[PDB]
Amino acid sequence: MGASRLYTLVLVLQPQRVLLGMKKRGFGAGRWNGFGGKVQEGETIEDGARRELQEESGLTVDALHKVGQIVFEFVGEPELMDVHVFCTDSIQGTPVESDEMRPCWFQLDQIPFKDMWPDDSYWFPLLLQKKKFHGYFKFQGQDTILDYTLREVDTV
């Protein structure tokens, strides 16, 4: 028995350029977005975002940078989705764009949040600002949003 779909979100955004993953054919063929991943049955969000990160663009990180935590509430369903945000810089592998994925290195002032998701623009502004925040967005199914909340954090 369990609940709350805890996933991850890794965006290799540097103070000069950003790396977004685009699909070639399937779920987002022609759209860029962070590399998210679900926390295995007993793994850490940093491990899920890391282990799933290396799989998205063959780029492995030695240590990402947690910035914010986004949440997704499903209308009509009790379950939810806890997505953590992580921005790396120190990678290992190569942009081994596969037949399913295709990353693109661009500028930190030209990242297209519209070609990713309806929440990117909500957690991007703080990322670029180097600030920590947490937002809760209610979805009408998976792509439509009906509620969005943003709370900045820093202390404990």
Instruction: Give the amino acid at 22.
Output: M
Any known ligand binding at 117? yes
Any known ligand binding at 33? yes
Locate the domains of the chain by residue range: 1-156
Nearest one of 1, 30, 125, 89 to 21, comparing CA atoms: 30
Instruction: Give the amino acid at 82.
Output: D
Any known ligand binding at 26? no
By what method was this entry solved? NMR
Topology (CATH) of 1-156: Nucleoside Triphosphate Pyrophosphohydrolase (3.90.79)
Any known ligand binding at 23? yes
Q: How far is CA 32 from the centre of its chain?
A: 11
| Distances, alpha carbon 41 to alpha carbons 48, 84, 127, in Å | 10, 17, 29
Burial class (CB in 10 A: 0-12, 13-18, 19+), 63: exposed
Gyration radius of the chain over CA positions: 15
